[PDB]
Amino acid sequence: KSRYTTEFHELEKIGSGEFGSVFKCVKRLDGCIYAIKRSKKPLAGSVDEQNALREVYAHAVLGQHSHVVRYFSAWAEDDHMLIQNEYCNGGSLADAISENYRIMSYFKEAELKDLLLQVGRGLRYIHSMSLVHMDIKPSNIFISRTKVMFKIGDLGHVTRISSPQVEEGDSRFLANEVLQENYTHLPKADIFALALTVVCAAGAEPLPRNGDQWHEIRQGRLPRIPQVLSQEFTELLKVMIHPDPERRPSAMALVKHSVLLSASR
Ligand SMILES: CN1CCC(n2cc(-c3cc4c5c(cnc4[nH]3)C(=O)N(c3c(Cl)cccc3Cl)CN5C)cn2)CC1
Ligand SMILES: [Cl-]
Ligand SMILES: [Cl-]
Ligand SMILES: [Cl-]
Ligand SMILES: [Cl-]
Ligand SMILES: [Cl-]
Ligand SMILES: [Cl-]
Ligand SMILES: [Cl-]
Ligand SMILES: [Cl-]
Ligand SMILES: [Cl-]
Ligand SMILES: [Cl-]
Ligand SMILES: [Cl-]
Ligand SMILES: [Cl-]
Ligand SMILES: [Cl-]
Ligand code: NA
């Protein structure tokens, strides 16, 4: 007799976290298919509650954009918090990249430009709302197939653009200035992470979490990419990982970039 059990039928598990999981569900009254994340509810009044509530608010304010997974509802039950989103039938970008890796057939240049432009429009929107994402990576981006659409789905590190305290995102995608607790240019940390996300989609080996190879990238050196890309596209990716955040393009500049003009729909 919970809301989750009475209003939805679970179809298939489609994601899994430490404190719960995501199911593809059909909603009984409207007949439509949704993705629903169900997680342990944090303590009332706790810091974890504040964090969980911020993530709900980020879905509720960002999900109407075409390149953010759409939000429908969120609720609490006795021991759980639930978020109901659109179901993206193509799954995560990380799983698409994993399959591509296995078969040796990666995203081609035109498809990489589409990914970069589409997630770039998502970031231009997020930044225009005075927010930053803080955890761009393949496992946080979802695919809808019909032309392909990429959508930012996980919003659990979103915070305001001038936040003086930040929960760092995945260390594989994290820009050095954030690691050093410099938060003057937070939008450019999302640009850095998006470039490395595109490098992953271009066929690169798994990125380092730490160590010498991690530091090499933070000097502005792109990882090896196993396919020929144009020099100007490669140069765009490199300047998006520039050690000086101010040299990286804004998301607005990225979506207006001459290199991505061909990708525009
Ligand atoms: C052939 N094959 C069949 C199965 C297909 N498949 C689709 C998915 C899938 C997961 C998922 C989602 C979401 C949205 N659409 C999704 N689609 C989504 O909104 N999620 C979410 C939610 Cl519900 C609340 C808060 C944050 C987030 Cl990130 C995360 N999960 C895991 C997995 N496999 C892939 C093709
Ligand atoms: Cl409902
Ligand atoms: Cl799963
Ligand atoms: Cl939408
Ligand atoms: Cl419950
Ligand atoms: Cl499907
Ligand atoms: Cl735009
Ligand atoms: Cl990932
Ligand atoms: Cl991950
Ligand atoms: Cl710094
Ligand atoms: Cl900035
Ligand atoms: Cl990786
Ligand atoms: Cl380089
Ligand atoms: Cl060129
Ligand atoms: Na949306």
Side-chain angles (χ1 to χ4, degrees):
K1 279 293 296 103
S2 70
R3 176 173 163 189
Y4 179 67
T5 298
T6 60
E7 299 295 354
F8 300 90
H9 172 63
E10 293 188 332
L11 295 169
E12 171 177 346
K13 186 183 277 186
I14 56 172
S16 186
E18 46 166 0
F19 291 120
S21 60
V22 186
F23 274 80
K24 178 190 180 183
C25 301
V26 52
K27 181 170 157 56
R28 296 178 194 283
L29 189 69
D30 71 12
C32 292
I33 299 176
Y34 297 96
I36 302 177
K37 178 185 185 189
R38 181 177 188 261
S39 316
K40 305 304 305 197
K41 187 166 77 184
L43 260 179
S46 65
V47 166
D48 296 344
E49 177 182 73
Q50 293 168 324
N51 192 62
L53 292 171
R54 177 172 48 199
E55 172 175 42
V56 169
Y57 306 158
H59 286 278
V61 306
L62 295 175
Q64 68 297 132
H65 191 262
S66 298
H67 296 281
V68 176
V69 176
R70 178 181 177 196
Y71 168 72
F72 290 87
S73 195
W75 63 99
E77 328 248 36
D78 287 70
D79 303 307
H80 290 86
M81 220 183 321
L82 291 95
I83 296 170
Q84 174 199 355
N85 278 347
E86 81 177 296
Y87 173 68
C88 292
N89 66 351
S92 62
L93 176 63
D95 286 346
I97 290 170
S98 286
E99 171 69 355
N100 285 354
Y101 187 83
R102 181 181 79 74
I103 70 182
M104 290 162 55
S105 186
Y106 312 119
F107 287 85
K108 73 201 187 182
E109 180 164 342
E111 300 172 313
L112 295 164
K113 284 175 175 180
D114 218 333
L115 167 66
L116 179 59
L117 180 58
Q118 286 193 36
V119 182
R121 294 186 185 291
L123 292 181
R124 186 200 188 172
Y125 180 66
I126 294 172
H127 301 161
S128 78
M129 296 287 274
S130 300
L131 291 162
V132 288
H133 181 274
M134 306 300 290
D135 194 26
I136 291 289
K137 57 172 167 176
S139 63
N140 286 349
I141 291 158
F142 289 85
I143 299 167
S144 285
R145 302 187 180 287
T146 50
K147 305 174 174 180
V148 65
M149 291 283 282
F150 296 103
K151 300 183 193 181
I152 299 167
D154 192 300
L155 301 178
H157 297 241
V158 167
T159 192
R160 288 288 294 275
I161 195 159
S162 310
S163 293
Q165 171 183 342
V166 159
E167 181 187 15
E168 340 192 280
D170 194 296
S171 74
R172 295 169 296 155
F173 297 85
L174 185 64
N176 190 62
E177 78 276 356
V178 179
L179 186 58
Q180 299 316 134
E181 304 174 73
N182 179 355
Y183 308 140
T184 303
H185 299 295
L186 294 169
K188 300 303 184 65
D190 291 335
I191 297 291
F192 179 103
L194 176 52
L196 295 178
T197 296
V198 175
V199 169
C200 294
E205 283 294 294
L207 297 170
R209 291 172 183 280
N210 45 249
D212 293 341
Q213 195 177 50
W214 183 102
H215 291 287
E216 186 97 48
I217 294 155
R218 278 80 187 163
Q219 292 299 306
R221 295 195 256 285
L222 293 164
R224 189 188 164 262
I225 291 168
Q227 61 166 314
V228 177
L229 294 178
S230 78
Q231 287 177 110
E232 72 183 347
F233 180 54
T234 297
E235 277 168 33
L236 174 56
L237 296 175
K238 188 179 174 66
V239 71
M240 291 169 72
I241 63 156
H242 199 288
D244 177 353
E246 304 194 69
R247 294 281 295 281
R248 305 175 198 147
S250 70
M252 172 167 72
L254 177 67
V255 306
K256 284 172 178 170
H257 205 281
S258 61
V259 175
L260 300 183
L261 197 70
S262 66
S264 191
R265 297 178 190 177

